Design a protein around this ligand. Structure first.
Ligand SMILES: [Mg+2]
Ligand SMILES: [Mg+2]
Length: 88
RNA sequence: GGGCGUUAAGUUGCAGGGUAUAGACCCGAAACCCGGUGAUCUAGCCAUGGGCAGGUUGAAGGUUGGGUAACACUAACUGG
């Protein structure tokens, strides 16, 4: 689950202060950040089915809570995906 | 007693009739063996030079976009 140090960086700008660790902005950011790095892990290995199963949770959850906010505070999303990368 | 002999002139030439060896009345095989001449046709190969109007289809490969959590996937265009 990446480094205990890491994510320290990403709570800023996304969050209003450090240890504001629960804004939906950050977890999404935490998830993507892992996922992205973590796609390297499945390049090599790749027949590591089990590890993948955990991945999709990250992806499922990410997407599930990326949909939550779509209902609350409009364009509190259109100010973060492009800020990050993903709307495919 | 028996068998074969003694009682029957031969021989050397010349001509003829046969026969033996020879091609041995004449013509005639398909073949067998020896030694030469042939890859200017043709089979294959070896160098060295030529030839294939015109019209199709459109593999791999590349680029881009869609698609994926990432892949798969898919669309043009390019390519030949
Ligand atoms: Mg562990
Ligand atoms: Mg010749």
């Amino acid at each position: 689950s990446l480094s205990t140090e890491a994510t320290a960086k990403i709570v800023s700008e996304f969050g209003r202060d450090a240890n504001d660790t629960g804004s939906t902005e950050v977890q999404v950011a935490l998830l993507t950040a892992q996922i992205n790095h973590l796609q390297g892990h499945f390049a090599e290995h790749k027949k590591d089915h089990h590890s993948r199963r955990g991945l999709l949770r990250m992806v499922s959850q990410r997407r599930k809570l990326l949909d939550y906010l779509k209902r609350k505070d409009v364009a509190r999303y259109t100010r973060l995906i492009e800020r990050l990368g993903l709307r495919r």
